[PDB]
Amino acid sequence: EKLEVGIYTRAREGEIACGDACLVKRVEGVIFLAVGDGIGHGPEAARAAEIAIASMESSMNTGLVNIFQLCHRELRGTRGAVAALCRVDRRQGLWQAAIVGNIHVKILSAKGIITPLATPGILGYNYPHQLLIAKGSYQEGDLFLIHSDGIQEGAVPLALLANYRLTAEELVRLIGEKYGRRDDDVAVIVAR
Ligand SMILES: [Mn+2]
Ligand SMILES: [Mn+2]
Numbered sequence: 001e002k003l004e005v006g007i008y009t010r011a012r013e014g015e016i017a018c019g020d021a022c023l024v025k026r027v028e029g030v031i032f033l034a035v036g037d038g039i040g041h042g043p044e045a046a047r048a049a050e051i052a053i054a055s056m057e058s059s060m061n062t063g064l065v066n067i068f069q070l071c072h073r074e075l076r077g078t079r080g081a082v083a084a085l086c087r088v089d090r091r092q093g094l095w096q097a098a099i100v101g102n103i104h105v106k107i108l109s110a111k112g113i114i115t116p117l118a119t120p121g122i123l124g125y126n127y128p129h130q131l132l133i134a135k136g137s138y139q140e141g142d143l144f145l146i147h148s149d150g151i152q153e154g155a156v157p158l159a160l161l162a163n164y165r166l167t168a169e170e171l172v173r174l175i176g177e178k179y180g181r182r183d184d185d186v187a188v189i190v191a192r
């Protein structure tokens with residue numbers, strides 16, 4: 001059955017462009033989910049977050065190491081950005097995820113609630129010694145939450161993600177509105 005995915009973003013109060021960006025891309029039973037947060041706020045941050053997302057999309061199915069290394073190259077000379085990507089291979093029942101910087105990922109799975117470890121750094125400026133790719137098993141019903149630091153780590157009550165009285169689209173909007181800081185850009189993806 002289809003993976004339901006909701007996206008929500010909101011600019012920092014007073015800005016007219018959101019400095020965070022989201023990507024959901026479906027490719028032959030493999031789904032990619034990404035959030036980027038351009039350093040700072042406003043249109044220069046937005047430019048960087050969108051460059052990061054566009055770069056990822058162009059690099060899909062070359063492997064996360066390559067994906068993040070090209071992101072870093074395309075972001076040289078810009079604001080820079082931090083970013084997370086989850087690659088969910090539903091057909092083979094596997095996921096991989098990695099994070100450069102402070103995007104937050106949580107994966108609620110039949111195997112347990114798993115929070116992938118971020119590697120410090122800023123794409124475009126300081127690439128980590130090496131990317132730490134978390135790996136796990138996926139089965140239908142597992143939930144993925146990704147958000148920028150517009151929402152504090154651990155702010156979202158987990159059980160809300162298993163509430164199917166709201167759609168994923170409705171749920172990420174509620175999450176962004178309840179938990180999103182108004183002094184920063186906010187971006188959230190939920191997939192289930
Ligand atoms: Mn930012
Ligand atoms: Mn489902």
Ligand SMILES: [Mn+2]
Nearest residue numbers: 037149150184
């Ligand atoms: Mn931020």
